[PDB]
Amino acid sequence: AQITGRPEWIWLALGTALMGLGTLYFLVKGMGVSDPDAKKFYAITTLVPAIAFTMYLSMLLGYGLTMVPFGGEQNPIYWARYADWLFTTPLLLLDLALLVDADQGTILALVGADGIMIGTGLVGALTKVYSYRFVWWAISTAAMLYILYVLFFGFTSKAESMRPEVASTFKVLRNVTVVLWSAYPVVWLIGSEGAGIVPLNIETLLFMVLDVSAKVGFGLILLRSRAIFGEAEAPEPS
Amino acid sequence: AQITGRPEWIWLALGTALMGLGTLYFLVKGMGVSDPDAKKFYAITTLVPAIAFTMYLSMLLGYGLTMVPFGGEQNPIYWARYADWLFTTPLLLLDLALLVDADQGTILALVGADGIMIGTGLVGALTKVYSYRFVWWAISTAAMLYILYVLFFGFTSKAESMRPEVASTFKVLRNVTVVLWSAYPVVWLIGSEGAGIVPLNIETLLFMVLDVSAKVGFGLILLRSRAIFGEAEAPEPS
Amino acid sequence: AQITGRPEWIWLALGTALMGLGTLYFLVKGMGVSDPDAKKFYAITTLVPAIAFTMYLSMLLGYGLTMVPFGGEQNPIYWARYADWLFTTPLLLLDLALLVDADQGTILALVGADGIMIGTGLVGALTKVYSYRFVWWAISTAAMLYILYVLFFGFTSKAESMRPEVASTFKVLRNVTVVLWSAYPVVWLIGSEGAGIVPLNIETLLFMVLDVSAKVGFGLILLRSRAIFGEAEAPEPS
Ligand SMILES: *C/C=C(C)/C=C/C=C(C)/C=C/C1=C(C)CCCC1(C)C
Ligand SMILES: *C/C=C(C)/C=C/C=C(C)/C=C/C1=C(C)CCCC1(C)C
Ligand SMILES: *C/C=C(C)/C=C/C=C(C)/C=C/C1=C(C)CCCC1(C)C
Ligand SMILES: CCCCCCCCCCCCC
Ligand SMILES: CCCCCCCCCCCCC
Ligand SMILES: CCCCCCCCCCCCC
Ligand SMILES: CCCCCCCCCCCCC
Ligand SMILES: CCCCCCCCCCCCC
Ligand SMILES: CCCCCCCCCCCCC
Ligand SMILES: CCCCCCCCCCCCC
Ligand SMILES: CCCCCCCCCCCCC
Ligand SMILES: CCCCCCCCCCCCC
Ligand SMILES: CCCCCCCCCCC
Ligand SMILES: CCCCCCCCCCC
Numbered sequence: 072a073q074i075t076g077r078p079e080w081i082w083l084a085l086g087t088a089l090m091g092l093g094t095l096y097f098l099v100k101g102m103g104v105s106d107p108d109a110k111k112f113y114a115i116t117t118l119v120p121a122i123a124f125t126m127y128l129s130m131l132l133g134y135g136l137t138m139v140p141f142g143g144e145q146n147p148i149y150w151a152r153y154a155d156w157l158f159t160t161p162l163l164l165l166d167l168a169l170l171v172d173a174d175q176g177t178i179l180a181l182v183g184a185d186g187i188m189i190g191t192g193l194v195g196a197l198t199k200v201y202s203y204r205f206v207w208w209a210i211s212t213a214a215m216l217y218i219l220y221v222l223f224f225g226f227t228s229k230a231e232s233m234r235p236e237v238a239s240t241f242k243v244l245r246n247v248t249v250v251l252w253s254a255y256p257v258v259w260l261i262g263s264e265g266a267g268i269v270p271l272n273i274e275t276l277l278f279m280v281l282d283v284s285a286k287v288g289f290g291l292i293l294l295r296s297r298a299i300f301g302e303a304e305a306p307e308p309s
Numbered sequence: 310a311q312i313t314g315r316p317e318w319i320w321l322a323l324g325t326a327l328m329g330l331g332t333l334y335f336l337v338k339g340m341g342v343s344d345p346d347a348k349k350f351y352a353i354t355t356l357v358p359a360i361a362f363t364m365y366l367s368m369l370l371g372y373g374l375t376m377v378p379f380g381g382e383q384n385p386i387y388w389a390r391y392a393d394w395l396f397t398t399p400l401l402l403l404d405l406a407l408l409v410d411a412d413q414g415t416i417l418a419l420v421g422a423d424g425i426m427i428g429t430g431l432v433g434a435l436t437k438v439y440s441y442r443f444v445w446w447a448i449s450t451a452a453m454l455y456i457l458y459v460l461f462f463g464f465t466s467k468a469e470s471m472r473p474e475v476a477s478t479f480k481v482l483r484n485v486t487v488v489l490w491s492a493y494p495v496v497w498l499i500g501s502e503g504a505g506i507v508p509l510n511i512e513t514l515l516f517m518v519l520d521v522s523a524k525v526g527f528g529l530i531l532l533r534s535r536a537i538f539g540e541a542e543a544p545e546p547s
Numbered sequence: 548a549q550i551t552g553r554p555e556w557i558w559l560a561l562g563t564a565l566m567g568l569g570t571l572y573f574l575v576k577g578m579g580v581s582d583p584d585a586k587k588f589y590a591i592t593t594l595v596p597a598i599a600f601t602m603y604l605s606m607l608l609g610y611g612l613t614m615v616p617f618g619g620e621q622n623p624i625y626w627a628r629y630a631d632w633l634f635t636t637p638l639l640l641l642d643l644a645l646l647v648d649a650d651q652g653t654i655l656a657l658v659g660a661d662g663i664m665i666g667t668g669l670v671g672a673l674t675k676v677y678s679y680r681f682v683w684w685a686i687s688t689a690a691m692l693y694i695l696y697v698l699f700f701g702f703t704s705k706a707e708s709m710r711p712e713v714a715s716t717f718k719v720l721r722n723v724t725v726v727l728w729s730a731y732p733v734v735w736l737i738g739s740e741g742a743g744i745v746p747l748n749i750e751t752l753l754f755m756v757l758d759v760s761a762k763v764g765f766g767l768i769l770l771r772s773r774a775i776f777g778e779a780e781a782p783e784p785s
């Protein structure tokens with residue numbers, strides 16, 4: 072943690088803090104919720120920042136950091152991010168899928184595709200041959216594009232099915248997802264794990280901003296809506 | 310396995326044996342059970358000691374043992390225990406949750422909180438900076454306390470819901486869980502992975518006694534009850 | 548990847564290719580399927596070769612290869628296969644279980660037993676003490692035999708239950724499974740990870756042929772049948 076990771080500590084520290092407080096806020100928010108469906112959205116959404124909190128701390132303390140030889144050098148790689156995403160990204164997808172009461176088959180596809188995206192991202196992050204790192208990047212990107220596709224096609228129906236009553240929240244949470252998520256591959260490609268055009272320091276800041284928005288930001292919007300209570304034809308505001 | 314792990318072999322061996330026989334006994338016990346719900350409790354409960362059997366053997370053979378530098382020394386750490394618990398603790402929680410027909414949202418919360426408890430416990434077990442090991446211990450402990458809380462609040466209802474007919478078993482299995490589980494953090498804190506007040510030898514014995522009671526002990530009580538067959542208003546003793 | 552793995556590259560390359568094309572074919576095949584149940588079989592079955600594709604490539608590029616000291620030598624071990632199987636074997640079992648609408652309890656048992664089979668296989672593959680490698684092999688084999696057993700007993704009922712209408716597909720997919728799966732333990736035992744009677748080169752070819760048949764082969768048969776649409780009393784050919 073001397074020359075490996077240090078300048079970026081500030082972002083890691085802020086990251087940890089913002090994720091901790093977010094978890095505590097959603098935790099308090101969920102107290103009292105007796106609604107079955109509401110219970111699902113709270114559990115899922117609370118765990119997301121909780122898990123990230125854990126991994127951000129591992130990176131801050133230096134545990135979730137490792138050196139990867141490539142390009143003829145020792146490159147500081149935060150593998151901890153993948154352990155985080157492995158569980159948080161599928162969970163966020165569960166939030167969107169549950170809103171529209173997606174089919175099991177669609178959930179499985181979304182989850183599997185995400186595991187591939189993260190798993191291949193991790194392999195690319197640890198791959199010793201530079202050129203091959205981008206081969207893994209391309210496959211993970213295809214996995215992501217598959218996911219984005221599913222979220223926009225064959226995932227809704229207003230004819231009393233998936234988006235018949237209150238689907239406005241889903242549309243907004245979908246907008247954020249596609250926008251934020253699509254930024255990760257770019258950051259990775261230009262940062263320390265990729266071309267190295269942006270220093271690890273700036274890379275960390277970007278991932279911190281993206282993570283907090285995709286977890287806490289995403290969470291705030293979802294847990295404030297009325298869509299988490301009713302889908303048939305009952306809002307349930309209070 | 311020379312100076313790293315040796316004196317504790319006896320407990321590891323006994324551990325392995327008691328877990329093996331327990332798995333074989335539950336295995337035989339489940340033969341014939343056609344009851345759907347009963348089938349769930351048998352599958353879950355049989356797998357628990359089966360998994361532990363595997364990990365206890367890995368520790369006995371030396372595979373699930375690693376050296377962790379901290380406190381200015383090479384500390385023998387049985388990481389295998391975490392691989393065990395990662396799967397067995399959520400499974401035990403599934404047994405309790407299924408008994409009371411808990412909500413999905415509650416199951417998710419219980420499972421997620423457990424994964425955090427185990428994951429953070431593992432990170433603390435492998436952390437190179439001594440003082441930081443206890444930071445991970447505190448977080449894992451909070452996760453555990455969260456779980457214990459859930460098991461005692463907003464997890465029952467006699468008004469024909471969660472604990473309307475036969476909930477006596479749940480109460481007894483809950484008593485054992487809170488008592489045994491709460492002992493793990495103490496053992497860890499005073500043993501080899503923590504302060505080092507108790508030798509690894511005695512630590513292993515304690516974890517062996519606790520594990521067998523929380524798995525086989527817990528299993529015997531559950532698989533003998535009638536609660537595994539009926540919940541509505543039918544015991545189904547024979 | 549110099550003396551460790553090289554001669555076997557051809558099989559790894561072919562493996563990668565056959566798995567890629569298989570995934571792409573099932574992908575195209577699933578386009579349009581609106582049937583809920585059909586959706587499950589397509590998702591599961593498509594992901595299988597997709598995951599294997601990823602791991603076959605990791606082995607081809609050298610990432611999923613490691614050296615394991617035993618027998619007084621450095622033995623080239625493709626650990627990547629276990630990461631593949633960890634997810635693909637349970638998924639294939641889900642296909643068979645879903646066809647007959649197996650009970651939850653039975654699915655859990657099948658899944659748990661498979662995780663043990665793969666996990667113990669992995670430990671045996673990485674174990675440093677030669678003789679102990681076969682102890683792990685025996686346990687994994689018992690796990691496999693348990694699975695085969697379940698697939699042939701207490702897994703069907705023509706009296707309007709599990710195999711009342713179209714169970715012919717299940718019988719054929721069961722025949723292939725038991726035959727192909729039973730070959731893996733033999734190959735492992737006689738190959739590089741075991742006795743070393745068959746060179747790693749030939750071992751790889753065998754696993755490649757077995758994998759493609761158990762994934763793509765198995766997939767083609769399943770995704771062409773009408774059983775994936777109806778079970779009650781409706782084929783749904785077109
Ligand atoms: C809380 C974190 C979230 C929502 C993270 C999402 C991450 C991604 C969409 C990352 C995807 C990647 C690729 C498509 C290519 C390879 C590198 C990754 C892992 C950055
Ligand atoms: C079969 C094993 C069982 C039921 C094990 C349960 C384990 C725990 C409740 C362990 C919890 C821990 C903490 C709360 C703090 C950090 C260390 C641990 C992992 C021992
Ligand atoms: C796509 C791959 C498939 C269907 C692979 C299946 C693998 C097995 C049935 C492997 C089982 C093994 C044992 C029973 C003993 C130890 C070694 C293994 C892992 C080869
Ligand atoms: C910043 C808080 C750290 C959390 C430690 C334990 C968390 C358990 C979270 C469970 C969340 C869903 C119910
Ligand atoms: C709303 C009922 C839930 C039925 C099970 C859904 C499984 C979702 C998989 C999520 C992946 C977890 C990391
Ligand atoms: C790099 C830009 C930082 C943006 C921070 C935005 C915080 C949003 C607070 C919510 C305000 C609602 C009206
Ligand atoms: C001590 C017995 C070792 C077990 C080896 C294989 C176990 C498979 C267990 C499946 C349990 C739930 C059905
Ligand atoms: C009784 C029906 C079961 C519905 C799914 C429950 C999922 C439980 C998660 C258990 C965690 C496994 C390690
Ligand atoms: C350290 C104390 C050992 C306790 C062993 C107890 C075994 C319990 C057997 C059940 C007896 C039922 C009457
Ligand atoms: C819907 C189930 C499959 C999801 C697959 C995502 C795959 C991304 C890369 C695949 C490589 C193709 C050979
Ligand atoms: C057809 C409804 C599905 C209910 C959940 C089944 C869980 C199957 C576990 C599969 C293991 C995944 C690797
Ligand atoms: C080692 C033998 C190779 C076998 C290849 C068989 C491919 C099967 C193609 C399907 C033909 C259907 C009539
Ligand atoms: C300086 C540490 C602060 C910890 C927060 C305690 C309050 C938790 C409740 C959140 C509303
Ligand atoms: C040496 C390269 C091996 C082939 C890799 C397949 C890559 C597919 C990328 C996504 C279109």
Ligand SMILES: CCCCCCCCCCC
Nearest residue numbers: 240243244246247288292
């Ligand atoms: C309708 C929900 C809005 C999501 C994006 C919010 C960005 C808020 C920033 C305030 C300047």
Ligand SMILES: CCCCCCCCCCC
Nearest residue numbers: 253254257258260261268
């Ligand atoms: C999604 C729009 C694409 C913008 C261009 C990104 C390129 C980044 C690399 C800088 C050389």
Ligand SMILES: CCCCCCCCCCC
Nearest residue numbers: 330332333334336337338
């Ligand atoms: C000395 C090894 C004993 C193995 C046990 C075989 C019997 C299994 C059936 C359990 C009632």
Ligand SMILES: CCCCCCCCCCC
Nearest residue numbers: 087091128444447448451
């Ligand atoms: C240097 C310490 C970093 C802050 C850690 C947060 C710990 C929370 C413990 C549970 C109350």
Ligand SMILES: CCCCCCCCCCC
Nearest residue numbers: 478481482484485526530
């Ligand atoms: C009502 C179930 C009892 C659980 C604790 C049992 C301990 C038994 C020990 C016998 C001396």
Ligand SMILES: CCCCCCCCCCC
Nearest residue numbers: 491492495496498499506
């Ligand atoms: C749950 C009751 C607490 C008893 C005290 C445990 C302290 C153990 C440490 C010994 C110095």
Ligand SMILES: CCCCCCCCCCC
Nearest residue numbers: 568570571572574575576
């Ligand atoms: C030489 C690479 C070929 C890639 C395949 C592109 C077509 C995909 C659609 C499959 C029918």
Ligand SMILES: CCCCCCCCCCC
Nearest residue numbers: 325329366682685686689
């Ligand atoms: C030194 C050997 C330890 C005992 C292992 C139990 C093996 C069971 C194999 C399956 C019948």
Ligand SMILES: CCCCCCCCCCC
Nearest residue numbers: 716719720722723764768
């Ligand atoms: C009834 C399905 C057949 C499964 C085995 C097929 C083998 C085909 C090989 C063609 C020579």
Ligand SMILES: CCCCCCCCCCC
Nearest residue numbers: 729730733734736737744
């Ligand atoms: C399933 C039939 C068994 C055939 C014999 C396999 C033995 C392989 C080892 C070669 C010495």
Ligand SMILES: CCCCCCCC
Nearest residue numbers: 084085087088089091
């Ligand atoms: C000198 C104190 C370091 C910062 C502590 C802040 C906790 C978020």
Ligand SMILES: CCCCCCCC
Nearest residue numbers: 088089091092093096
């Ligand atoms: C150390 C700062 C604590 C953050 C509290 C949350 C502000 C809304």
Ligand SMILES: CCCCCCCC
Nearest residue numbers: 182183186187190634
């Ligand atoms: C159900 C998803 C399986 C996870 C596969 C891992 C991808 C490399």
Ligand SMILES: CCCCCCCC
Nearest residue numbers: 212216219220223253
């Ligand atoms: C209709 C979608 C436009 C193209 C989106 C992304 C390209 C990879």
Ligand SMILES: CCCCCCCC
Nearest residue numbers: 242245246247249250
């Ligand atoms: C909700 C409409 C999406 C438009 C996205 C623009 C793509 C660059």
Ligand SMILES: CCCCCCCC
Nearest residue numbers: 246247249250251253
């Ligand atoms: C409503 C416009 C959608 C914009 C989506 C952004 C494309 C990257």
